[PDB]
């Protein structure tokens, strides 16, 4: 039921299996890996120690046999990462993309919603 993560920048997270489609709409890991390259300057810059985990959690979200939904990031981590990384996008004339809008993620790991919050699987 769950597929291993083929994306190289996503291979050290604490989980290693996923299920497409991801939280951005890709059916294929390979398309997600291509789109991920857009962010490598940001990752290289080091605006947030959580950026890689956050992007991987969105582009290649955690799958488990016990759960029928992709498990993505919590809104809290998204807001934290946005706070640190959006300034870098903006100084270069870009913006925090709509597809990473922090509203589309659950606010906290509830018993009413599941999401990840740190580099914790
Ligand atoms: C981010 O996502 C949120 C949640 O969908 C958006 O909030 C809605 O935005 C639309 C478009 O203007 C409004 O019609 C709704 O009334 C908004 N809902 C709420 C609760 O604010 C938001 O527009 C998106 N963009 C940003 C930058 O936050
Ligand atoms: C995936 O990662 C976990 C983390 O400890 C490891 O125990 C498991 O053997 C790994 N499996 C694969 C297929 O990478």
PDB file of C-alpha atoms and ligand atoms in Angstrom:
ATOM      1  CA  UNK A   1       0.000   0.000   0.000  1.00  0.00           C
ATOM      2  CA  UNK A   2       2.916   2.333   0.581  1.00  0.00           C
ATOM      3  CA  UNK A   3       5.713   3.237  -1.883  1.00  0.00           C
ATOM      4  CA  UNK A   4       9.357   3.936  -1.037  1.00  0.00           C
ATOM      5  CA  UNK A   5      10.688   7.482  -1.540  1.00  0.00           C
ATOM      6  CA  UNK A   6      12.692   7.733  -4.772  1.00  0.00           C
ATOM      7  CA  UNK A   7      13.585  11.447  -4.358  1.00  0.00           C
ATOM      8  CA  UNK A   8      17.221  11.895  -3.256  1.00  0.00           C
ATOM      9  CA  UNK A   9      16.801  15.149  -1.347  1.00  0.00           C
ATOM     10  CA  UNK A  10      14.031  13.497   0.672  1.00  0.00           C
ATOM     11  CA  UNK A  11      15.905  10.419   1.910  1.00  0.00           C
ATOM     12  CA  UNK A  12      17.047  11.178   5.495  1.00  0.00           C
ATOM     13  CA  UNK A  13      13.649  12.362   7.097  1.00  0.00           C
ATOM     14  CA  UNK A  14      12.675   9.695   9.668  1.00  0.00           C
ATOM     15  CA  UNK A  15      10.203   8.116   7.290  1.00  0.00           C
ATOM     16  CA  UNK A  16      10.996   6.564   3.933  1.00  0.00           C
ATOM     17  CA  UNK A  17       7.729   5.629   2.464  1.00  0.00           C
ATOM     18  CA  UNK A  18       5.058   7.732   0.779  1.00  0.00           C
ATOM     19  CA  UNK A  19       1.906   7.560  -1.318  1.00  0.00           C
ATOM     20  CA  UNK A  20       1.100   9.807  -4.286  1.00  0.00           C
ATOM     21  CA  UNK A  21      -0.664  12.133  -4.985  1.00  0.00           C
ATOM     22  CA  UNK A  22       1.245  14.559  -2.792  1.00  0.00           C
ATOM     23  CA  UNK A  23      -0.133  17.719  -1.158  1.00  0.00           C
ATOM     24  CA  UNK A  24       0.656  19.752  -4.209  1.00  0.00           C
ATOM     25  CA  UNK A  25      -1.095  17.476  -6.741  1.00  0.00           C
ATOM     26  CA  UNK A  26       1.653  15.346  -8.354  1.00  0.00           C
ATOM     27  CA  UNK A  27       0.748  11.743  -9.168  1.00  0.00           C
ATOM     28  CA  UNK A  28       4.397  11.004  -9.834  1.00  0.00           C
ATOM     29  CA  UNK A  29       7.423  11.258  -7.567  1.00  0.00           C
ATOM     30  CA  UNK A  30       9.559  12.172 -10.556  1.00  0.00           C
ATOM     31  CA  UNK A  31       7.517  15.359 -11.285  1.00  0.00           C
ATOM     32  CA  UNK A  32       7.764  16.279  -7.621  1.00  0.00           C
ATOM     33  CA  UNK A  33      11.560  15.823  -7.700  1.00  0.00           C
ATOM     34  CA  UNK A  34      11.746  18.149 -10.703  1.00  0.00           C
ATOM     35  CA  UNK A  35       9.621  20.820  -8.968  1.00  0.00           C
ATOM     36  CA  UNK A  36      11.733  20.445  -5.810  1.00  0.00           C
ATOM     37  CA  UNK A  37      14.851  21.725  -7.652  1.00  0.00           C
ATOM     38  CA  UNK A  38      13.249  25.183  -7.678  1.00  0.00           C
ATOM     39  CA  UNK A  39      13.990  25.341  -3.954  1.00  0.00           C
ATOM     40  CA  UNK A  40      17.581  24.174  -3.772  1.00  0.00           C
ATOM     41  CA  UNK A  41      19.004  27.762  -3.655  1.00  0.00           C
ATOM     42  CA  UNK A  42      16.821  28.373  -0.609  1.00  0.00           C
ATOM     43  CA  UNK A  43      17.978  25.096   0.917  1.00  0.00           C
ATOM     44  CA  UNK A  44      21.610  25.960   0.206  1.00  0.00           C
ATOM     45  CA  UNK A  45      21.138  29.392   1.771  1.00  0.00           C
ATOM     46  CA  UNK A  46      19.969  27.881   5.035  1.00  0.00           C
ATOM     47  CA  UNK A  47      17.119  30.222   5.990  1.00  0.00           C
ATOM     48  CA  UNK A  48      15.440  27.467   8.006  1.00  0.00           C
ATOM     49  CA  UNK A  49      16.792  24.178   9.368  1.00  0.00           C
ATOM     50  CA  UNK A  50      13.256  22.836   8.837  1.00  0.00           C
ATOM     51  CA  UNK A  51      12.852  23.770   5.154  1.00  0.00           C
ATOM     52  CA  UNK A  52      13.985  20.446   3.709  1.00  0.00           C
ATOM     53  CA  UNK A  53      11.736  18.422   6.020  1.00  0.00           C
ATOM     54  CA  UNK A  54       8.784  20.726   5.354  1.00  0.00           C
ATOM     55  CA  UNK A  55       9.154  20.481   1.551  1.00  0.00           C
ATOM     56  CA  UNK A  56       9.605  16.706   1.637  1.00  0.00           C
ATOM     57  CA  UNK A  57       6.536  16.384   3.917  1.00  0.00           C
ATOM     58  CA  UNK A  58       4.546  18.285   1.250  1.00  0.00           C
ATOM     59  CA  UNK A  59       6.056  16.793  -1.931  1.00  0.00           C
ATOM     60  CA  UNK A  60       6.502  13.246  -0.673  1.00  0.00           C
ATOM     61  CA  UNK A  61       4.146  13.025   2.370  1.00  0.00           C
ATOM     62  CA  UNK A  62       4.381  10.183   4.902  1.00  0.00           C
ATOM     63  CA  UNK A  63       2.413   7.019   4.191  1.00  0.00           C
ATOM     64  CA  UNK A  64       1.634   4.219   6.633  1.00  0.00           C
ATOM     65  CA  UNK A  65      -0.413   1.023   6.329  1.00  0.00           C
ATOM     66  CA  UNK A  66      -2.614   2.030   9.280  1.00  0.00           C
ATOM     67  CA  UNK A  67      -3.681   5.389   7.808  1.00  0.00           C
ATOM     68  CA  UNK A  68      -5.561   6.069   4.543  1.00  0.00           C
ATOM     69  CA  UNK A  69      -4.456   9.636   4.087  1.00  0.00           C
ATOM     70  CA  UNK A  70      -1.112  11.219   3.225  1.00  0.00           C
ATOM     71  CA  UNK A  71       0.455  12.667   6.360  1.00  0.00           C
ATOM     72  CA  UNK A  72       1.851  16.129   5.726  1.00  0.00           C
ATOM     73  CA  UNK A  73       3.231  19.028   7.782  1.00  0.00           C
ATOM     74  CA  UNK A  74       1.469  20.855  10.604  1.00  0.00           C
ATOM     75  CA  UNK A  75       0.468  24.497  10.029  1.00  0.00           C
ATOM     76  CA  UNK A  76       2.776  25.497  12.860  1.00  0.00           C
ATOM     77  CA  UNK A  77       5.914  24.299  11.117  1.00  0.00           C
ATOM     78  CA  UNK A  78       4.706  25.834   7.823  1.00  0.00           C
ATOM     79  CA  UNK A  79       4.304  29.237   9.526  1.00  0.00           C
ATOM     80  CA  UNK A  80       7.710  28.924  11.123  1.00  0.00           C
ATOM     81  CA  UNK A  81       9.364  28.020   7.793  1.00  0.00           C
ATOM     82  CA  UNK A  82       7.481  30.726   5.891  1.00  0.00           C
ATOM     83  CA  UNK A  83       8.569  33.348   8.462  1.00  0.00           C
ATOM     84  CA  UNK A  84      12.201  32.520   7.879  1.00  0.00           C
ATOM     85  CA  UNK A  85      12.244  31.697   4.151  1.00  0.00           C
ATOM     86  CA  UNK A  86       9.703  34.093   2.574  1.00  0.00           C
ATOM     87  CA  UNK A  87      11.978  37.094   3.267  1.00  0.00           C
ATOM     88  CA  UNK A  88      14.614  35.400   1.083  1.00  0.00           C
ATOM     89  CA  UNK A  89      12.127  34.799  -1.718  1.00  0.00           C
ATOM     90  CA  UNK A  90      10.951  38.415  -1.542  1.00  0.00           C
ATOM     91  CA  UNK A  91      14.384  40.070  -1.620  1.00  0.00           C
ATOM     92  CA  UNK A  92      14.827  38.259  -4.924  1.00  0.00           C
ATOM     93  CA  UNK A  93      11.436  39.326  -6.194  1.00  0.00           C
ATOM     94  CA  UNK A  94       9.612  36.034  -5.568  1.00  0.00           C
ATOM     95  CA  UNK A  95       6.919  35.120  -3.056  1.00  0.00           C
ATOM     96  CA  UNK A  96       5.782  32.234  -0.842  1.00  0.00           C
ATOM     97  CA  UNK A  97       3.832  30.124  -3.318  1.00  0.00           C
ATOM     98  CA  UNK A  98       0.076  29.549  -2.984  1.00  0.00           C
ATOM     99  CA  UNK A  99       0.656  25.820  -3.170  1.00  0.00           C
ATOM    100  CA  UNK A 100       2.524  26.190   0.208  1.00  0.00           C
ATOM    101  CA  UNK A 101      -0.134  28.439   1.779  1.00  0.00           C
ATOM    102  CA  UNK A 102      -0.046  27.569   5.473  1.00  0.00           C
ATOM    103  CA  UNK A 103      -3.832  27.460   5.650  1.00  0.00           C
ATOM    104  CA  UNK A 104      -4.022  24.174   3.734  1.00  0.00           C
ATOM    105  CA  UNK A 105      -2.309  22.319   6.576  1.00  0.00           C
ATOM    106  CA  UNK A 106      -3.854  21.378   9.939  1.00  0.00           C
ATOM    107  CA  UNK A 107      -2.927  23.782  12.761  1.00  0.00           C
ATOM    108  CA  UNK A 108      -1.519  21.172  15.147  1.00  0.00           C
ATOM    109  CA  UNK A 109      -1.240  17.434  15.550  1.00  0.00           C
ATOM    110  CA  UNK A 110      -4.681  16.937  17.010  1.00  0.00           C
ATOM    111  CA  UNK A 111      -6.666  13.839  17.702  1.00  0.00           C
ATOM    112  CA  UNK A 112      -8.860  15.529  15.136  1.00  0.00           C
ATOM    113  CA  UNK A 113      -6.142  15.796  12.456  1.00  0.00           C
ATOM    114  CA  UNK A 114      -2.830  14.090  11.880  1.00  0.00           C
ATOM    115  CA  UNK A 115       0.266  15.935  10.701  1.00  0.00           C
ATOM    116  CA  UNK A 116       3.965  16.066  11.346  1.00  0.00           C
ATOM    117  CA  UNK A 117       5.518  18.948  13.338  1.00  0.00           C
ATOM    118  CA  UNK A 118       9.238  18.678  13.322  1.00  0.00           C
ATOM    119  CA  UNK A 119      11.724  16.302  11.771  1.00  0.00           C
ATOM    120  CA  UNK A 120       9.772  13.700  13.693  1.00  0.00           C
ATOM    121  CA  UNK A 121       8.055  11.069  11.623  1.00  0.00           C
TER     122      UNK A 121
HETATM  123  C1  LIG B   1      -4.374  31.090   1.808  1.00  0.00           C
HETATM  124  O1  LIG B   1      -5.381  30.143   2.059  1.00  0.00           O
HETATM  125  C2  LIG B   1      -6.465  30.662   2.791  1.00  0.00           C
HETATM  126  C3  LIG B   1      -7.433  29.525   3.133  1.00  0.00           C
HETATM  127  O2  LIG B   1      -8.148  29.097   1.991  1.00  0.00           O
HETATM  128  C4  LIG B   1      -7.166  31.744   1.968  1.00  0.00           C
HETATM  129  O3  LIG B   1      -8.203  32.312   2.742  1.00  0.00           O
HETATM  130  C5  LIG B   1      -9.352  32.588   1.922  1.00  0.00           C
HETATM  131  O4  LIG B   1      -9.019  33.390   0.810  1.00  0.00           O
HETATM  132  C6  LIG B   1     -10.094  33.585  -0.088  1.00  0.00           C
HETATM  133  C7  LIG B   1      -9.607  34.395  -1.285  1.00  0.00           C
HETATM  134  O5  LIG B   1      -9.533  35.758  -0.935  1.00  0.00           O
HETATM  135  C8  LIG B   1     -11.270  34.283   0.610  1.00  0.00           C
HETATM  136  O6  LIG B   1     -12.368  34.392  -0.276  1.00  0.00           O
HETATM  137  C9  LIG B   1     -11.666  33.556   1.897  1.00  0.00           C
HETATM  138  O7  LIG B   1     -12.601  34.334   2.612  1.00  0.00           O
HETATM  139  C10 LIG B   1     -10.420  33.310   2.741  1.00  0.00           C
HETATM  140  N1  LIG B   1     -10.721  32.567   3.952  1.00  0.00           N
HETATM  141  C11 LIG B   1     -10.156  32.917   5.110  1.00  0.00           C
HETATM  142  C12 LIG B   1     -10.526  32.077   6.303  1.00  0.00           C
HETATM  143  O8  LIG B   1      -9.373  33.872   5.219  1.00  0.00           O
HETATM  144  C13 LIG B   1      -6.184  32.837   1.541  1.00  0.00           C
HETATM  145  O9  LIG B   1      -6.818  33.687   0.612  1.00  0.00           O
HETATM  146  C14 LIG B   1      -4.942  32.209   0.913  1.00  0.00           C
HETATM  147  N2  LIG B   1      -3.919  33.195   0.652  1.00  0.00           N
HETATM  148  C15 LIG B   1      -3.199  33.746   1.608  1.00  0.00           C
HETATM  149  C16 LIG B   1      -2.150  34.708   1.125  1.00  0.00           C
HETATM  150  O10 LIG B   1      -3.398  33.500   2.802  1.00  0.00           O
HETATM  151  C1  LIG B   2      13.204   2.914   6.466  1.00  0.00           C
HETATM  152  O1  LIG B   2      13.649   3.637   7.599  1.00  0.00           O
HETATM  153  C2  LIG B   2      13.521   3.012   8.858  1.00  0.00           C
HETATM  154  C3  LIG B   2      13.989   3.992   9.939  1.00  0.00           C
HETATM  155  O2  LIG B   2      14.624   3.332  11.021  1.00  0.00           O
HETATM  156  C4  LIG B   2      14.323   1.707   8.848  1.00  0.00           C
HETATM  157  O3  LIG B   2      14.223   1.086  10.108  1.00  0.00           O
HETATM  158  C5  LIG B   2      13.821   0.801   7.720  1.00  0.00           C
HETATM  159  O4  LIG B   2      14.587  -0.381   7.657  1.00  0.00           O
HETATM  160  C6  LIG B   2      13.913   1.562   6.395  1.00  0.00           C
HETATM  161  N1  LIG B   2      13.356   0.811   5.291  1.00  0.00           N
HETATM  162  C7  LIG B   2      13.653   1.132   4.032  1.00  0.00           C
HETATM  163  C8  LIG B   2      13.015   0.287   2.967  1.00  0.00           C
HETATM  164  O5  LIG B   2      14.407   2.064   3.737  1.00  0.00           O
END
